[PDB]
């Protein structure tokens, strides 16, 4: 003795809201003692992050508990019959990013190790800052099909074709109408539709709308035409 040391903390420098981040904690350095157990407290901004779980490998046992939002107590124990190794991630504390925030602090405090006879030795803490960014989903922008036309006008049927809308984010399919009533809903993989059971020499109105994953529906494109 006397016993000295310090914690290691590894994380990615940036994370987006809705993501988990894995905070790897270990022992950076330890002098004049071997660590069979290692206790530490992870501190975080509870408005920025939420605790999820703690996660370790086979030969480490981890008791992790939340003290209060912002503070997780982690008890790490070797299960190998050997001391915990230094310069390695020993436990991973998984946090859920909750809010856009710049330079959010992550710190390990109240750190100590237990030696072979169960004597406990305080070791120095560590900190790191992390940037949380918005994660936001892309804007769903609704637009009509294009190039809507009858590719074939027969006596008793009519095939219509079209081109996809200008905006395809969250495009799901198309709805088809004849003389002001819905006749079909189809997938976005379809580019053509045949209206069957028509009367010869007869005027019809045909319309199509594009339908989007948010439940929104585009303006309708319309054809009026008479069968052969």
Curated annotation (Swiss-Prot):
Span of domain Fibronectin type-III: 144-228
Superkingdom of the source species: Bacteria
Biological role stated in the UniProt entry: Binds carbohydrates. Capable of hydrolyzing the glycosidic link of O-GlcNAcylated proteins. Can bind and deglycosylate O-glycosylated peptides from mammals. Can use p-nitrophenyl-beta-GlcNAc and 4-methylumbelliferone-GlcNAc as substrates (in vitro).
Family according to the record: Belongs to the glycosyl hydrolase 84 family.
Protein name: O-GlcNAcase NagJ
Taxonomic path: Bacteria, Bacillati, Bacillota, Clostridia, Eubacteriales
Gene: nagJ
């Amino acid at each position: 003795a006397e016993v000295t040391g310090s914690v290691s903390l590894e994380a990615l420098e940036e994370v987006q809201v809705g993501e988990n981040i894995e905070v790897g904690v270990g022992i950076d350095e330890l002098v004049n003692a071997e660590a069979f157990a290692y206790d530490f407290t992870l501190n975080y901004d509870e408005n920025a992050f939420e605790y999820v779980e703690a996660i370790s490998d086979d030969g480490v046992f981890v008791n992790a508990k939340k003290i209060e939002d912002g503070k997780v107590r982690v008890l790490v124990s070797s299960l190998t019959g050997e001391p915990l190794p230094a310069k390695e991630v020993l436990a991973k504390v998984v946090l859920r990013a909750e809010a856009k925030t710049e330079g959010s602090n992550l710190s390990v405090t109240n750190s100590s190790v237990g030696d072979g006879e169960g004597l406990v030795h305080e070791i120095a803490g560590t900190e790191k800052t992390v940037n949380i960014i918005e994660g936001t989903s892309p804007e769903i922008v609704v637009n009509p099909v294009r190039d809507f036309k009858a590719s074939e006008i027969n006596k008793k049927n009519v095939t219509v074709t079209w081109t996809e809308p200008e905006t395809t984010e969250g495009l799901e399919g198309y709805i088809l109408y004849k003389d002001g009533k819905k006749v079909a809903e189809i997938g976005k993989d379809e580019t053509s539709y045949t209206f069957k059971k028509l009367n010869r020499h007869t005027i019809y109105n045909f319309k199509i709308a594009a339908k989007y994953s948010n439940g929104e529906v585009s303006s309708k494109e319309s054809l009026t035409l008479r069968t052969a």
